[PDB]
Amino acid sequence: KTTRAINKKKKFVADGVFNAELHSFFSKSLQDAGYAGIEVRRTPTKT
């Protein structure tokens, strides 16, 4: 039972923002090789 329950709305918006966080993180640092995108499969086990 993963800690706190969250509005599928609330948790989804959180999901998107996290993805857009990663996008700035990668693109900003991986500024050498052709960066493109990120297929992120998040599990309460492995991100």
Partner: protein, 105 residues
């Protein structure tokens, strides 16, 4: 026969992908013998609306961007044992597709 009623919940940001899991989960469960499935039920499509004034600086007329994020939730019920489920969940489901499970007797 240790029967366990299983609840398959699927919530997703886009319809393309969530419909594949749903379509195939049933396609796969019907084909097993120890299986009893309650049709794939579609909950009401929740829509998160965000209306935004376009331009950054407040000049020029009123321009508004109506942004949407749709969330489809599908629910499937199962009559099986604990191994049966893990047998049917062996798909290759797209990213951002949350699948929750509830087990009762």
């Amino acid at each position: 026969v240790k029967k366990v009623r299983v609840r398959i919940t699927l919530t997703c940001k886009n319809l393309k992908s969530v419909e594949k899991a749903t379509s195939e989960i049933v396609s796969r469960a019907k084909k097993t013998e120890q299986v009893e499935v309650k049709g794939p039920v579609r909950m009401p499509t929740k829509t998160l609306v965000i209306t935004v004034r376009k331009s950054p600086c407040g000049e020029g007329s009123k321009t508004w961007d109506r942004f949407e994020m749709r969330i489809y939730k599908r629910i499937i019920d199962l009559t099986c044992n604990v191994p049966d489920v893990k047998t049917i969940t062996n798909f290759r489901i797209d990213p951002g597709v949350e699948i929750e499970l509830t087990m009762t007797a």
